[PDB]
């Protein structure tokens, strides 16, 4: 019947800049996940990517509550026996702040092919400066 469906021809992506400084990792990430998916758009269509591009600046200034800086471990496994490796959140934020944000958001996106495509619209930067001036990105202020 009549429910409109977005498609490649119809879709128009904005670029947005989110400042991570002073934001809680998960609270910021949940909002950004929703923007990359396109959940803020009335033309949201579940089988295409209706989301916007997001730049995150000041990734190393992201905050964590509690004792998470010391106590949140990022595990990975190399698929070699005994190959569990770990970094603390402090080690992550100091030396891999872009990965830290990318992991949080990646875990909040849908998991298959379109989800993987949705992640490609994210761009995370350690500093205050991003290289995407030519895309003319607007500041997006995170809601509650």
């Amino acid at each position: 019947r009549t429910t409109p469906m977005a498609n490649a021809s119809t879709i128009e992506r904005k670029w947005l800049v989110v400042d991570a400084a002073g934001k809680t990792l998960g609270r910021l990430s949940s909002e950004v996940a929703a923007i990359l998916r396109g959940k803020h758009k009335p033309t949201y269509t579940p089988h295409v990517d209706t989301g916007d591009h997001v730049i995150i600046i000041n990734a190393e200034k992201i905050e964590l509550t509690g004792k998470k800086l010391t106590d949140k471990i990022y595990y990975r496994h190399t698929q070699h026996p005994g190959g569990l490796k770990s970094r603390t959140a402090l080690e992550m934020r100091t030396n891999y702040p872009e990965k830290m944000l990318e992991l949080a958001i990646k875990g909040m996106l849908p998991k298959g092919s379109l989800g993987r495509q949705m992640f490609k619209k994210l761009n995370v930067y350690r500093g205050s400066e991003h290289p995407h001036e030519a895309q003319k990105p607007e500041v997006y202020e995170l809601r509650g």
Binding site: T3, P4, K39, H40, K41, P42, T43, Y44, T45, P46
Partner: protein, 118 residues
Amino acid sequence: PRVKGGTVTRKRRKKVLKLAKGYFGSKHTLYKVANQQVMKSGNYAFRDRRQKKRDFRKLWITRINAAARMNGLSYSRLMHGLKLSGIEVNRKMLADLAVNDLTAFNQLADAAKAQLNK
């Protein structure tokens, strides 16, 4: 009198294989597996004719929420306000306005806001 098997068997089986057109490999070719897949397709299609109604309502709700939040309402508050104002326009129609006639959607949303602010 003797009744040979005759032609009934292949006529019946041919019909199943015709319903299996476009299935992968042996599933469009061999009766026993085509028959299992056509049967399974029936159970799925029955289930999915029910799910379809759940899925579209989910989609409309998502779009109404997006349009609502562009007017400073959550979907929940909007739907509460529309019910208080007496408006019975359904989710399929609200979501259609949200996409196709957003000014109209905003009038309905403004009607809802009025009732909530009372």
